[PDB]
């Protein structure tokens, strides 16, 4: 399957090099999405585990 393996010589591992990008950033909508309404209040997210899996 033709691995290309961009090498690294600098820190900050997501360097984003040898990589173009044709998606127009900061503005796109062409498909309908569920929940177009930020209306729901805090009801079910338990604050003991509202957090993601890791921050340590």
């Amino acid at each position: 399957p033709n691995v290309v393996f961009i090498k690294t010589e600098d820190p900050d591992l997501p360097a984003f090099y040898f990589d173009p990008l044709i998606n127009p950033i900061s503005h796109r909508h062409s498909v309908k999405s569920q929940e177009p309404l930020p209306d729901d209040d805090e009801e079910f997210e338990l604050p003991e585990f509202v957090e993601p899996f890791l921050k340590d």
Partner: peptide, 27 residues
Amino acid sequence: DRLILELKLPPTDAYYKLRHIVDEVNG
């Protein structure tokens, strides 16, 4: 795993690429 262990994208550009390919296959 070929996308981020081999091309090593950040989370934002990976979300951009995945939303781009989903919108591309939608169109």
